[PDB]
Write a protein that binds this ligand. Structure first.
Ligand SMILES: [N]S(=O)(=O)[C][C][C][C][C][C]C123[B@]45[B@@]67[B@@]89[C@]1%10B81%11B698B746B814B562B%10%1143
Ligand SMILES: [Zn+2]
Length: 258
């Protein structure tokens, strides 16, 4: 049992191969908006994506991901709760079988239809493998998706998903601008946590934006046509690829806004 999201290999099984699943700083979590403290010392987040170079889009058996050139400081996250500079490696999504679930973080127990993660790693550690071994190695920018109006900036992604239906498939995905996926406000919540997929490493500063983006029903329906399986294996829709909320334990969620 390679891990997944089903009855026999899903999140409640992960601790057997990855014991840190039951650790002290696991993600995602419920963001209780009334308990999160406004921290007037938190800086605005700096998102510098003007020089981003997308490379490929890939179905990895658990999500689909757009990968970027992280060999230079072209698309970087700085400021906010972070020290130093974090390079964009990839983005991917988590989504549901229906619109009432799909997000990993929840807000006062509310689930969104999907959640976008933009994954960045701290350049002081030189590469992402080294960064995942450090408590401040990664910064993941989390954006909620609700269903309503279409997101134009998402359409270029949606339109190539038919070409990466099954696990292992990839395609050229150049000149994609991730600025088109961002909401107006960069107000955020932040807390120390983990990767939400194996190996569940406790290396992430989470930055979760308050404002969701709206996507259309037709856009999310295309997510739901992807397959967890490889080509030629029984077809199993890539849906509900989200880890549930984990215990907060001894952590404080801080808000950038009043
Ligand atoms: N859902 S989420 O946003 O929390 C997920 C972020 C996963 C980022 C990739 C980290 C990795 B995985 B293990 B070690 C590092 B080296 B090897 B494989 B390579 B990938 B890279
Ligand atoms: Zn993720």
């Amino acid at each position: 049992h390679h891990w997944g999201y089903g009855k026999h290999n899903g999140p409640e099984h992960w601790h057997k191969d990855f014991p840190i699943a039951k650790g002290e700083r696991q993600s995602p979590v419920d963001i209780d908006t009334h308990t999160a403290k406004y921290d007037p010392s938190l800086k605005p987040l700096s998102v510098s994506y003007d020089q981003a170079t997308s490379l490929r889009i890939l179905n990895n058996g658990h999500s689909f991901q757009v990968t970027f050139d992280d060999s230079q400081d072209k698309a970087v996250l700085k400021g906010g709760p972070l020290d130093g500079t974090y390079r964009l490696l990839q983005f991917h999504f988590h989504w549901g079988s229906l619109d009432g679930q799909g997000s990993e973080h929840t807000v006062d127990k509310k689930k969104y239809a999907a959640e976008l993660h933009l994954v960045h790693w701290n350049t002081k550690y030189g590469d992402v493998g080294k960064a995942v071994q450090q408590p401040d190695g990664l910064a993941v920018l989390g954006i909620f998706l609700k269903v309503g109006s279409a997101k134009p900036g998402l359409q270029k992604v949606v339109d190539v998903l038919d070409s990466i239906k099954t696990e292992g498939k990839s395609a050229d995905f150049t000149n994609f601008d991730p600025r088109g996926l961002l909401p107006e406000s960069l107000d955020y919540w932040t807390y120390p946590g983990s990767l939400t997929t194996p190996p569940l490493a406790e290396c992430v500063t989470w930055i979760v934006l308050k404002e969701p983006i709206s996507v259309s029903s037709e856009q999310v329906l295309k997510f739901r046509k992807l397959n967890f399986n490889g080509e030629g294996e029984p077809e199993e829709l890539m849906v509900d690829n989200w880890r549930p909320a984990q215990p907060l334990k001894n952590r404080q969620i801080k808000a950038s806004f009043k």
